[PDB]
Amino acid sequence: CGVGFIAAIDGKPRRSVVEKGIEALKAVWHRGAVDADGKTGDGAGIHVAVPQKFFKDHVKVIGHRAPDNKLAVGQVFLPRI
Amino acid sequence: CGVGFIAAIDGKPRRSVVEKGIEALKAVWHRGAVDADGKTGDGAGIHVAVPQKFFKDHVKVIGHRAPDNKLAVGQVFLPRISLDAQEACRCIVETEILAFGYYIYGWRQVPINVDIIGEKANATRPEIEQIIVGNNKGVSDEQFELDLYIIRRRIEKAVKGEQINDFYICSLSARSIIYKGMFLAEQLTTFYPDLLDERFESDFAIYHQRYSTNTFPTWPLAQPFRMLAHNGEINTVKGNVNWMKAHETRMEHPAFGTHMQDLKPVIGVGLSDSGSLDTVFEVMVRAGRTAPMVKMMLVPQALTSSQTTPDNHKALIQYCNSVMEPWDGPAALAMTDGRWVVGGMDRNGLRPMRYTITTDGLIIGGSETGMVKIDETQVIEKGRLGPGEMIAVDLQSGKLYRDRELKDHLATLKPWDKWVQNTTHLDELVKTASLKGEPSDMDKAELRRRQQAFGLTMEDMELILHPMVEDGKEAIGSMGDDSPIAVLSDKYRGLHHFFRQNFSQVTNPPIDSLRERRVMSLKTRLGNLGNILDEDETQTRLLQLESPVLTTAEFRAMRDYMGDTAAEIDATFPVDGGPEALRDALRRIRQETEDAVRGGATHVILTDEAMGPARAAIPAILATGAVHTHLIRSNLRTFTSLNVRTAEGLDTHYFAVLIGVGATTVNAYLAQEAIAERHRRGLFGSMPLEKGMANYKKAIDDGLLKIMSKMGISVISSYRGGGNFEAIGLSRALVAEHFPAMVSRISGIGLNGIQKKVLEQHATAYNEEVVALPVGGFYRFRKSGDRHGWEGGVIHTLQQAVTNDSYTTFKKYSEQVNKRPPMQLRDLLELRSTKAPVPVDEVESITAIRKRFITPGMSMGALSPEAHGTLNVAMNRIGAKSDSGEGGEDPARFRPDKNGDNWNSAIKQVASGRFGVTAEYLNQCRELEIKVAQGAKPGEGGQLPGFKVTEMIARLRHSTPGVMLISPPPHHDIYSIEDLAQLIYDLKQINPDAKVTVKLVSRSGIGTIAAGVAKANADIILISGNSGGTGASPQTSIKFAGLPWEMGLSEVHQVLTLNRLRHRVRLRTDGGLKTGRDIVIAAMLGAEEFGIGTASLIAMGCIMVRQCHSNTCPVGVCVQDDKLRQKFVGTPEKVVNLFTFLAEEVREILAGLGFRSLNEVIGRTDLLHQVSRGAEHLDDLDLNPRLAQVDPGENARYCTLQGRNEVPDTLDARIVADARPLFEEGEKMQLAYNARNTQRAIGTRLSSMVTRKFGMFGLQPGHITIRLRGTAGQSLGAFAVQGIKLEVMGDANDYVGKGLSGGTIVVRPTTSSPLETNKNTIIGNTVLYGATAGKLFAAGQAGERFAVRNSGATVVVEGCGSNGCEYMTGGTAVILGRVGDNFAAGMTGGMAYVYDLDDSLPLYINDESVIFQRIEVGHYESQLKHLIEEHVTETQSRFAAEILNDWAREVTKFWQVVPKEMLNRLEVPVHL
């Protein structure tokens, strides 16, 4: 178990932010619940800023025209059965 | 699968009832689906009476005082994971029960045993408990039950309000209890040991087991429900739910009271068809009616216009049909009110139900007639249940009512005769309306400008409109649809092209509208809706129409009858409205209609006659959909009607969609105007305008009936407003906002695209000077019309590449065919991998890929014998498999020629007509095939013109030369999934080496059907598309039926991989495959084998003439005459080179991607992307639904098993182990055994052994004889050959003598039975289905559809049922008893003799294609005499012996039925 955050003071979006976030997540296993099957966790999550360039390049590859303002994305969990 | 009931006639409880119920459940395991686990089931249930002494002793043990009145017990399913939701549920139940004043005695945990349930069904097992509630207020029993029902409903609502999952109430009543679960049928008394008690005694019991189509068990979905038990499926649930939502807003009864407000949403969410039907049944029963009356009102009889029914029953049926919409579909029901116990059937009678009366006052009914053992010296009468029949038991009075007595007892409560007279008709009003007020026909210029505004070309009036008025039947096409889809088109396609129709796969049978037409009604009622819980005369005072479509005069007359109570609404929007004019117009009209219906108006007419050069017309479909949905959501549709005036209706598919959307009547005036304008120019000849209009209306009605019958709906009232279509190319939001219940897997255009299209067409039509209608290309290729898949240059270069044998021009062909703009859904996909390319020489060889291509089946009636033989030789040369299609095949081609070329076929088909199936035809193949529906005409049987059946095809199909042959749409063998499993078992028993293939048609929901068929031990699935070829079929079924094969392929693959079943079956596709790119894409979607079809026809000489139905094809591919067959130039080398180049190309593609085998690509959907057509079309097609990638887990993505799926062995195994001298020395054998209903297909493997050893006619009759004592199973003696003689003592279940091929079957009661042989049923339904030779002598009455599709068999029975001797072709049938309605329907050959003593044949026979007369020739007397003598000798009957005794006076009681086409072909004429 554990909570943490990383912030750039000036306001640079940069890769080292996500680098250090993932590195921090990779160093918490000692507090978590040690389990037998080795695969079932108890819940984990990360929260970051939306990479406009990624989704804009994706939409371009689809064939649309990338807008100028900020694009929005939503993540959904739908039924599976 | 199976439902049944047991009842004590006098009504005294006894343990034997529950004991026999358990015993009956213990003997149904053979119909269900076995599993490798051995513990996993799909649902079982029993329903009995409350053992008052048991719970009273329980209460005594606890320490309380035993009450006097009857106690109440409720059974509940609570959640099991959390321990807090249980407390909330208990608190809710206790605060709701104590709110009425009853006293709670306590809870009880039911003792169970979880050791026998499987692993998957144990993950969702709820916590089962019981609550004991007593009655202290001294209130009567009926008020007690009413209060319990109200309490249960309010509990359900309150628990729903808090969003608690896994909560159910199996039953809450002081009369009955229900034990149901997700275990095996035989393990019921082990899971619930309570039933093993000596104190559970009752006077009635119901038992049920089901057959699920998936592998996800939900405990609250097991049957029986509260006060119902259903077997089958209901076809009309999407329409009945909406009409329930409309009937809810006016129903109320003084019995409930204020609590009525707590009962409004009668049908909740998360129920099956039977669940909703049960809820409606219960809410209607609790209001005062009885079980027989509710059964009559929900699933009524077929109101036949015959004199075989008294008029009281007719008034009753009229009332019940007028008050409520029927719930059609295959349904065998066993329901039970608190007092009555009823068992009944549906309208058509598709499922079987047989009962038995014992001397102990015990009635036992079920699906099979041998489930409960009963000494034959203790029965009184055996019977059956026909269509619409019912049998009831009154427990309070202790009486038993059969059909007629119950009808006469029910027709005495209310005087319906004086009530039905309140109705009025329209024909009388049209007659009294004198011919005045004829309005002037519009101008020719006006007519042309109005027709151009909708895009009507001239071929739409020269090709598809001329036949309707000239003859009365639609046109006929002879090739598949190779035109682009509506959204991908660039011309003006009407909105009605986006909607594809529906049909019924193995889950439901289609209905034959040509022969079984007596059960189809097109009545319409205006002013019909009302309170469904009242009894008065105001419920039958209304206006009645005989058809939904109307002419101009009838519409005007109806308008004058309506008067000032009707309100007309414009349906036009300004051309100068702007970018959002259509949405504003829709809102305007949907508000005006709501404001008008509130102001007293009872009739809404949606007109658009104001269309001019300044106002564009709203597409009628959109308008009526919006209005109907807005009236439904506003609780107003129950008050008014909805009449539509359109200026587009020309075809039969328009009115179908308009009625399915919700319109009541539809008026098309532009069509009549164009008809009059074409008649006044002298084009129809000497026929008046009135006769042309009558023929046009008749054609429209027949087309509507045909479109309605592809699904199984027989009444228009339940089909209206159900949304029985699928939208392709329309946005999800639009169809979810405007249309009741339709699915659109891929989004499409919104309202802006539609507005652009309509404005463009309106401007083109009204802003320019039009001189004539364009030629237009939609059914034939034109340079100005639409584009086609098969153009001229493409066929030319393909024939060149195939003939000259050079790969370069084949590459040019592929380039030219994949350079065109997008036309199909597989054009928007883009192949993109991530690896490094590899050389082309190292991928798998061509033979290893050519061995994966198959040619589909093409009947010998459609194709010419030369082309079929050429294909069969060409496909057997490289190692691939061919297909013979329906219509049989030449037996002489069963051997290789001297040249080494084998004309045989590797895949034989089993169609619905069974035109050439025998015991030798099914032993000459490596893989069988079950054709459920064809890719071109889904939900219909193949056609063949009357001149295409030459003498060769006549002797090959065992048919009459020069008669049109139309196979029945259903199979009469596949009425449900367990029937399909039985048929697969039979096919796997008759051929011990072959595999069984099921062919399906792409549509929505095919995933569940494919998951269900995989459990039926099939191993090859074939998903066809909507663009497949055909021989002869209507144009509407070609253009407006089916879906692209991508949907079906992707959906079936995903569903199979989701249920851990993909590793058991193979997948195969066809339809529109031309190149190697399509093959790579299809293999990437999940297929493993591929079909080509029409391309091979082009490699042999086809030039896309589309005139195969006319027998005048120029090249000589699909012909039957000689002088054009001589022009044939086909060559097998052409097909070989085509397949070779096709494999070369896919090798090139695989090399370019980076893989080395097709096995590395199957299922890898992640290698596909969607590319847009640009930023100028603005079509929002989203293909992610077909790009979803489910992960298999451990198992592979394809079939990883060798050989077919094996099946258990029946009795025949022992026979093969005993009759060894028969095969080793060839001597006579006489065997005796005991038969049971758990042993299917007795005498089938032995038939295969005999056929392989000696042949079909190699042995003298009676060489090996077998004697069975006891009720035999299903499909007794199927596909028996000459030399085998089975003799049953007892009775047979069903499908007896199916596909007989020379054997001999004899069924008779046991020697010590006290039964009149000619008054009891002894065999089931579908006897001698598709037989070709043999004999059969029964000593009882047959079931329904007796002697269907007979070709050469001889049968003598002492009775028959409904629809008997249907579509017979040859043989002789003697019937010593009564027959049912519609006898001898569609008979085109043979002869029949009926022994009529009540002089009632002229009322039951179907005098359309046959003639019935008296015997007048001694030659035809000797035949009957010898047949009856042989019957007496074989079965030792006493009735037939009596008839043979008094022959002189009994010869004068026989009617002879002879077909009409066989009056001048017999050798001895029937006349003098």
Ligand SMILES: Cc1cc2nc3c(=O)[nH]c(=O)nc-3n(C[C@H](O)[C@H](O)[C@H](O)COP(=O)(O)O)c2cc1C
């Ligand atoms: C001339 C012709 C006759 C056909 N006859 C039958 C038939 O008798 N039974 C059947 O199930 N399908 C029949 N079909 C349909 C094919 O089995 C297959 O579904 C179709 O040819 C696939 O279309 P495609 O060539 O465009 O891939 C026939 C097709 C054609 C063109």
Ligand code: F3S
């Ligand atoms: S389209 Fe048909 S009619 Fe002959 S030329 Fe081709 S097979």
